[PDB]
Each structure stands twice: as C-alpha cells, then as structure tokens.
C-alpha cells in the first residue's frame, strides 16, 4: 500500500498567487487559512461578494433600492437573515472560528485596500461569520431548492 506524498507543513501565513491570479493560501492553522481565503476572494470578487452578503442580510432594498426589493421581500418573508444568525450560533466552536476568520479576511482586505471596493458596497462592511452563513443559506435553500419563481409562479433566470 503506497502512501501519498508528504504533506507540506506551513511555517508562515502567506498567499502565493500564480500568473492566472489563482491564490495558494498557506496557513499555520485552520483559521489562518480561512482568513487568507476570505482575503483572496475579496481581492478577486470583492464587490459582488459584498453585494450578495448585503442581500442575504435582508438589506438589498435598503442599500440599493427597488431593483433589489423583491429579493428582500422573499428573504425576509422566509426568515433567512434571522435563521442565519441561529445557524451561526449553532455551529461547532471550531468551525465557527473558521467562519469568523473568513469574514475577518474579507474585512481586512477591504480595510487595507479601500480603493478596490466599489462605493456602493462599502456600506456593507464589516461582514461577519453570520453573513457568510446567511449567503450560503440563501444559495442552497432559497435559490437552488426553493426559488422565488417556483413559489410565485414567474419565469426562469438570465440566459438567452
């Protein structure tokens, strides 16, 4: 039974990015790697991440007006933001710390590079572990499983 190659043991926290902008995040422990990952995602997709986290808070209509209002009504009516706070508290201690670290990484990216964050989404910062849980909740249960279109009797999302 051949064993795999020796696992790398990181001695410092660093992102080594390659020439296509792929981050290789090395952490001395789990929370450090999650923080690095949050930082990297904020660098690569920061604006749209903040916008989505804003929506999953129930705050789309408040932050960005009418175009975001029907999603706000869907998510508030289905209790998504409060349920996310519940699920966040119901995490295991260890995994909650990874989620907090991911959110801290986002916040730290934005704090050290405020020029990279679009004006319209700055009001979303700071983000929390619960925000991360909430977007995942909206995505799985209230986009994939239960879509507004199926319940409300509308149409299917952007292609054509």
């Amino acid at each position: 039974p051949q064993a795999p190659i020796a696992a790398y043991k990181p001695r410092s926290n660093e992102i080594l990015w390659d020439g296509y902008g792929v981050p290789h995040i090395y952490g001395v422990d789990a929370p450090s790697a999650f923080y690095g990952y949050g930082w990297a995602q904020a660098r690569s997709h920061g604006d749209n991440i903040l916008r989505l986290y804003g929506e999953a808070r129930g705050k789309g209509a408040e932050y960005w007006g009418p175009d975001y209002e029907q999603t706000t009504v869907w998510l508030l009516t289905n209790g998504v933001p409060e349920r996310a706070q519940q699920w966040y508290a119901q995490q295991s201690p260890d995994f909650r710390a990874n989620l907090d670290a991911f959110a801290a990484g986002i916040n730290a990216y934005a704090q050290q590079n405020p020029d990279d964050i679009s004006p319209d989404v700055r009001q979303v910062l700071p983000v929390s572990g619960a925000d991360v849980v909430a977007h995942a909740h909206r995505l799985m249960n209230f986009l994939y499983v239960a879509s507004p279109g199926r319940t409300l009797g509308q149409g299917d999302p952007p292609d054509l």
Partner: protein, 522 residues
C-alpha cells in the same frame, strides 16, 4: 453539468480519474466560480466554488476529490391555500394565520430611505405568498434545521477515507445535488444527495405542482436518510456519471431501477442526448489514460443529427425548392461535429429549434420514442418527414436572417469574447448531444453570438502519487474592474489548452508572481 469518475480497473495506469465540469451562467454573480488552493499542517484542498462560499465544493487533493451536478431534489412544496373568513380551510375547519408585522427600508432616488411595512403570514405549512393571479401559496422548505451545510462540505472534502466521507455525507446537511467522489485508494461513488421529505403518496410531478393546502394528508414532517437515496459505489462497469439526467443510468450496467425508490425523488423522463453520450464515452472506452479522458471530455457531437438526418435528408431532396435541396446536401456532407469550421451546424440548430423546440428537449417529432431499455440509442427517427421538411424550409429562412447565409462557419458566428479577447467557438448545445457545452446566446445584428452558460470550471484529475490534474476557468479567476484575470484564459479554452493545476509546494514556488504575507490576530 457533467461528472465522471473512473475506477482503477478501467484505466491503464491503475489510478482513478475524476472530471469536474459544472455548467452555470457566465454572468449571474452568485453562480460565478473561483479557483483556489488552501494548505494547513492538517489539510489541503484545491478547486473551485461559488464566490462568497468559504468551502470548496469542487475539491480535490492528493487523496480524494468530489464534483457536483444539479439533481433538482424536490426539497420544498408549494401549497395552494383555500382562503375563507380571514383564514384558510384546513381539515374541515377555518384556521387563522400566524401574522407578524415586520418592516424594511427602501433606498430612494435621493439617497434617503423610507420605512416600508411588510406583513408576514404563515399557515402550518409555512410562509404565505400571493401570486399576481391571486393564488395564495404557502411554501414549505425542508431542512431548515440543518445548520451544518458548510461544515459537512468541509469534512467531506478533507475526509481521511471514504468511510469518513460517507459519514459526513450521511449528516444530510447539504440539501441537494448529485455528488460524485473518487480517491487514490480506488473507490468511486455516485450519490443522488439531498433532503427529501418522506411522503406516503404522489409521484414527483404531483409534488412539483401546487399540492392541496387544505389537509394534513399532504403535510410531511420527516425526511429520508442517505441510505434511502439512489447511490452507486465501485460498480461492475468501473465508472459513474451524471449529466443532469435522472439517476437511472449513473453507470452501465445499472445497479438499480426506478421501482427500487419512491416515485417522488426523481423524474423518469427521457435522458438528454448529452447524458446518453456521457454513458457511451465512459462505457465504450477501456484502458483510459488521463490524456484520453481529457480528449473525451471535449466531445461535441451533433447526436440529434445522427437520430434525424437519415430520415430528413432524402425527404428534403424530394422537395422542389432548390434551396431546400441544397440545404439537404449541405447537411448530408457534414461530419455531424460542432467544429469551428462547420458550414452546416448553424442551419442544423435552427431546424432542431423547430423539430425539438427552442430548448431541443421536445420528443414529439421522433419516430421511435425514448426508452430506458435502450437508454443511449433512443429516441430515433423522424415521425413525419413531410412536416420536418417544412420545418427545414422555415429554418433556412431563419438561418439566413440570423447569420446572413445558410453556410456561415460555426466558429465565425460563435465567438468567445471577454474584454478584448475574441476567439473562435466550438461545441454547443447539450440537448443536441454536445458533451462539452456552450449555450450560445441569440445572435446580435451581425450574427455574432457568445456563451451565456456552459463550460466554466473544468478539471480532470488522476489520483496517482503524486496526483496529476489539469483545468481551465472560462471567465478567469477575477471579475473585479481592471483585473488582468478575467479574459486571460478564454484563448486557452478556445484551443483546449489546459493548465497544469499546481498542488506541490515546489511547483507553486516556481509559478509564483505575487506574494501576500498575512496574519490573523483574533
């Protein structure tokens, strides 16, 4: 989306192979994928995931990997309520709603907010919405008590063994998706995963429609555990697959049938021609290398032309219109591959739009209907060739109007364009048989079209020691304004020139172009 896992016995070198190949919109923000590599002293994960997710759904490492496709697990019910006397009828008697006065703020054009009230009503079923047409619908979503979705994925993708993988999967915290697994020890697995309500009656279509909201008869309360769901591990055929087909040919020969499961879990509809190709490409090939595995992934066959052109062409050559006759000869001489240089493909698509509907999934035009007894060779034939020739007449006109001619090269109309990169297209619509998918948009005024959806993250992994993996991301790793990493992979995609995915520290150090020291002080 496509997904393949191949067992060691079906390969030349003896190492399992995995294909990750999700198809989603190239524009929808929450569907945008991101590639990354996380390494700590205790775990390593490489792969892609939707932005804003802190765990990698399409992951692999030196020991194992997974991939996902949409299965449509019916995890919610929409109930039609019968309103009466300010309440709703339920088990003979009027029952009042739970009602809660909430509110939210709405941004105004001048940058201020106004406070807007929002009543939230629930029946026993769940929250109540009113459709425009006046129907009161209560929605009941399963699995609202499953807080561990992210951690389940995290434990699945860092599993020390298949047994640990399965134990995590078995928590039922991930509410949907087909999930395919493979590892360096040689195990492959397919699971039709999700949180599915236990119900005592009704097939899937009944539970996808509006279910009566006036009786506890239809009020489910429990959900199925993992071992009630279609699954396949290390099957005799040496592979598993799913290309969004119902879970009834996840391998070949099969290991179960629809009768073996409750009829509300998955449909028993005809498998797409892409799904049929998925099965053929794995089953008909033996002694697979990673190189051959990758070549097979690029398959772009107009399978529906295989099923229809034998009947359509001679019928069309009978027609007195010289243009229809010429359309028939052009189609007859085509090798039935969606290549850049194909002069017939665009015209064939337009014919198929009419023959099989705008989504190409229509069955009524075929002479021989689909059957699970011949799941990769039906449906077949043209039922009414005279009608189909009329469809070709119309399609000729449509083709000329959209593209300027009946024989414009496929890759001249079909382009992949990101920022200032503009490269020739190939492959196409899944429902026509193309395994590699590019769901081409409608053309602009000049007949140019681009992918709205299709290949996004694509990776193929051999679980040798060390592992060997290749991949591309159609739309790059960044979408932030000004990034050099949005349009920098699409030219490679146009040539199927895959990047070696770099997991070993020495490879990473050789490829490094930027270093971000960080530290996290809780």
């Amino acid at each position: 989306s496509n997904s393949w896992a191949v067992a060691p016995g079906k390969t030349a070198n003896g190492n399992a192979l995995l294909l990750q190949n999700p198809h989603l919109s190239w524009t929808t923000d929450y569907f945008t994928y991101y590639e990354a590599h996380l390494v700590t002293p205790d775990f390593e994960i490489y792969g892609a995931t939707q932005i804003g997710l802190p765990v990698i759904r399409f992951a692999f490492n030196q020991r194992m990997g997974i991939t996902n496709t949409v299965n449509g697990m019916v995890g919610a019910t929409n109930y039609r309520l019968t309103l009466q006397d300010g309440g709703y009828l339920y088990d003979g008697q009027v029952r009042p709603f739970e009602r809660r006065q909430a509110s939210y703020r709405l941004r105004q054009a001048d940058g201020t907010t106004v406070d807007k009230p929002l009543e939230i009503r629930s029946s026993v079923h769940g929250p109540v919405f009113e459709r425009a047409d006046g129907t009161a619908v209560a929605v009941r979503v399963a699995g609202l008590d499953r807080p561990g979705m992210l951690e389940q994925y995290f434990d699945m993708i860092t599993a020390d063994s298949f047994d640990d993988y399965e134990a995590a999967l078995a928590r039922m915290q991930v509410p949907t998706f087909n999930i395919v697994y493979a590892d360096r020890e040689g195990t492959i697995n397919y699971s039709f995963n999700g949180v599915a309500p236990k119900r005592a009656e009704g097939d899937i279509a009944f539970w996808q429609g509006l279910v009566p909201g006036d009786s506890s008869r239809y009020l489910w309360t429990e959900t199925h555990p993992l071992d009630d769901l279609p699954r396949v591990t290390n099957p005799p055929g040496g592979f598993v697959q799913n290309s969004n087909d119902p879970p009834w040919t996840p391998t070949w020969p099969v290991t179960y049938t629809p009768k073996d499961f409750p009829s509300y879990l998955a449909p028993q509809t005809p498998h797409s021609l892409r799904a049929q190709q998925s099965v053929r490409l794995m089953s008909e090939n033996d002694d697979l290398t990673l190189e051959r595995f990758m070549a097979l992934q690029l398959s772009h066959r107009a399978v529906m032309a295989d099923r229809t052109l034998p009947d359509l062409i001679p019928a069309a050559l009978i027609d007195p219109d010289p243009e229809v006759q010429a359309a028939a000869r052009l189609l007859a001489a085509w090798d039935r591959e969606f290549t850049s240089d194909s002069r017939a493909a665009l015209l064939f698509e337009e014919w198929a739009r009419l023959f099989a509907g705008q989504n190409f999934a229509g069955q009524a035009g075929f002479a021989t209907p689909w059957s699970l007894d011949k799941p990769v060779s039906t449906p077949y034939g043209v039922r009414d060739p005279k009608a189909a020739v009329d469809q070709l007449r119309t399609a000729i006109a449509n083709t000329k109007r959209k593209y300027g001619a009946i024989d414009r090269p496929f890759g001249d109309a079909s382009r992949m364009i990101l920022n200032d990169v503009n490269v020739p297209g190939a492959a196409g619509y899944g429902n026509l048989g193309s395994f590699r998918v590019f769901t081409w948009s409608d053309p602009d005024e000049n007949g140019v079209r681009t992918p709205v959806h299709g290949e996004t993250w694509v990776a193929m992994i051999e679980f040798s020691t060390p592992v060997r993996a290749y991949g591309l991301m159609s739309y790059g790793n960044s979408r932030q304004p000004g990034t050099t990493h949005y349009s920098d992979q699409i030219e490679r995609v146009s040539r199927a020139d895959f990047r070696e995915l770099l997991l070993r520290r020495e490879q990473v150090e050789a490829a490094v172009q930027e270093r971000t020291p960080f530290n996290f002080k809780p």
